[PDB]
Amino acid sequence: LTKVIAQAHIDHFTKWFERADKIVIVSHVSPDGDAIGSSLGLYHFLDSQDKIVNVIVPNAFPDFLKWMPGSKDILLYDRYQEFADKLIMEADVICCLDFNALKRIDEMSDIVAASPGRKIMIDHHLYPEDFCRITISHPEISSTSELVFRLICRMGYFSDISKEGAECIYTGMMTDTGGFTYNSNNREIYFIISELLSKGIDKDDIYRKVYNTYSESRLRLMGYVLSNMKVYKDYNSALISLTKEEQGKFDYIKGDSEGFVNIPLSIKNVCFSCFLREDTEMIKISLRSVGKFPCNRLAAEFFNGGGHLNASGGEFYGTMEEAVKVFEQALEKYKPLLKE
Ligand code: NA
Ligand code: NA
């Protein structure tokens, strides 16, 4: 209902949109629900308007997103580089969805940077770069999928958002707010959800497809990791870990530890959570916080990593007990910050 996106930006893109024959949509490395949801949401709309549209991402997306209509036609850059490169170089318009810095598309950077096609960014992350000619940057909005819905609506094409398109948009809104459990207080979110439901989507089924679709081994693994968790009561923090012996034992598949780092936050007075995993070769670190404790600051100092305020990661080249000791240093240094 409220006009968040600048009308001038909407006017400009509409010009590009009407002139364009060939359009490419790009999103970030290791794309997730909102990367794929926003991209596929835009794809379905654009494809309904007699346009050649291809979605290209650097990297495979999780299997729990395969159900999404159009997902099979998403082009993986690390498997069809030459083909993708041609599409990118020849695109009249390149839509950059759910990232704001060329490093977020890891190896696609150069071809995207070089292409003479007209670039527009549609994103909700903080601190955007100026590689796009049109920049729609709204970090106050909780997902890129919502911005895509908003853009299409403001252009006057709400009626051309299909059931399939709506499914993809809802999926991204859902995943980026943890099923509307964080950063979701805004009223207009729920009007948008209602609008998407009017397109025939089944939001409950979509929840199940994304979150209630994984192996017996994965869930037993989650339980084992939780059984062996370490809580530091004076530091409002929790630690969980997986070794190579533990991973191999439970038959670890890629993406099995996804979300594990969040579970310890469901303990009362635990606002900061760390997960340590040995790689296939040393210690991978995942950090999560609830509230305002800066995950990205600790990661940058103690694990040469980074990311966002509430979710970060990085590697530590050493051993488990050695990596655990480093984690215990950071807890000690930022102890006063945690107590606030
Ligand atoms: Na808007
Ligand atoms: Na941004």
Ligand code: NA
């Ligand atoms: Na997401």
Ligand code: NA
């Ligand atoms: Na909020």
